[PDB]
Homo-oligomer: A and B are copies of this chain.
C-alpha cells in the first residue's frame, strides 16, 4: 500500500484536510491507508471513510448515468450509427466504478466487519456493505445480477435486525440505513410497496421517540426524517 509508510494519525489528519479541500479521491486513499493499519475505527473515523467513498462513487455513478442515457438514445429507432465509442466509454467508467465498490467491500471484509462488535459500528459497516453492493447492482446485467442484489439485501437485513434490537428509532445510523434499504426496495428489488411501508414506519417510529432527545439530537434526527418524507412524497 502506498500509504503503508505514513502514520495512522497523519492519514487521518490528511483525510480531514482533503475533505476541507473537496479532494475526495485523496480522502479515500488516506482513509484506506488508515483502515489497512489494522486498528478499529472510531465514530469520527468511520464517518471520514464513508464520506470519502460516497463522494468518489457518487461522481462515478452520475457520470455512468449520463453515458448510459446517451447509449440508450443511440439504440433507439432512427438513430444514426455512431460506432462503439459510447459503449466503450460507458464501460470504462463502469469498470472504474466497480473497482471502487470492490475496494470498499474488501476493506469491510478485511477486516472491519468481523472486528465490529458495538451496534453503532456493526450497523454502520453493514449499511456500507449494502450500499456498495447496491451500486454494483445498479450497473449489473449478467449471470450474477441476482446474487449481487441478494448480497445487498442480506447485508441491509442484518443491519436492520441489529439496529431494531440495539438502537433507538431516532438513531441517525438506523434512520440512514432505513432510508437506503427503502431506496433499494424501490428501484433495485422492484418492491415499491415495501419501500413505502419501510419509509413510513421508520418515520412514524422516529416521530414518537423525538420527545426523549436533546435539542441537538432532535436536529440530527429530524434532518434524516425529512429525507424519508421527501421520498414518501415523491413515491405516493
- Which residues of A4-24 are within 8 A (CB) of B? 10, 13-14, 17-18, 20-23
* CB within 8 Å for A70 and B20 given contacts A10-B85, A85-B10, A85-B14: yes
Question: Is there an interface contact between B83 and A17, defined as CB atoms closer than 8 Å?
Answer: no
Question: Is there an interface contact between B83 and A10, defined as CB atoms closer than 8 Å?
Answer: yes
* B10, B14, B66, B82: the one within 8 Å of A20 (CB): B66
Cβ contacts under 8 Å, A93 to chain B: 21, 23
> Is A235 engaged at the interface, CB distance under 8 Å to the other chain?
no
> Is A227 engaged at the interface, CB distance under 8 Å to the other chain?
no
Question: Is there an interface contact between A67 and B14, defined as CB atoms closer than 8 Å?
Answer: no
**Nearest chain B residue, comparing its CB with the CB of A17:** B89
> Is A86 engaged at the interface, CB distance under 8 Å to the other chain?
yes
Taken together as a complex, chains A and B put the C-alpha atoms of A196 and B208 apart, in Å, by 63
Interface of A is mostly: helix
- Which residues of A65-93 are within 8 A (CB) of B? 66-67, 70, 82-83, 85-86, 88-89, 92-93
> Is A213 engaged at the interface, CB distance under 8 Å to the other chain?
no
Taken together as a complex, chains A and B put the C-alpha atoms of A98 and B14 apart, in Å, by 20
Taken together as a complex, chains A and B put the C-alpha atoms of A180 and B127 apart, in Å, by 48
> Is A223 engaged at the interface, CB distance under 8 Å to the other chain?
no
Cβ contacts under 8 Å, A88 to chain B: 14
Cβ contacts under 8 Å, A13 to chain B: 82-83, 85
Cβ contacts under 8 Å, A70 to chain B: 17, 20
Question: Is there an interface contact between B66 and A21, defined as CB atoms closer than 8 Å?
Answer: yes
Within the complex, the shortest CB–CB distance from A175 to chain B, in Å, comes to 31
Question: Is there an interface contact between A21 and B63, defined as CB atoms closer than 8 Å?
Answer: yes
Within the complex, the shortest CB–CB distance from A190 to chain B, in Å, comes to 27
Within the complex, the shortest CB–CB distance from A26 to chain B, in Å, comes to 8
Best-buried of A10, A20, A22, A85 by chain B (most CB within 10 Å):
A85
Within the complex, the shortest CB–CB distance from A234 to chain B, in Å, comes to 25
Cβ contacts under 8 Å, A21 to chain B: 62-63, 66-67, 93
**Nearest chain B residue, comparing its CB with the CB of A66:** B21
Cβ contacts under 8 Å, A85 to chain B: 10, 13-14, 17
Q: List 11 A-B contacts (CB under 8 A).
A: A13-B82, A13-B83, A14-B89, A17-B67, A17-B70, A17-B86, A17-B89, A18-B89, A21-B62, A21-B63, A23-B63
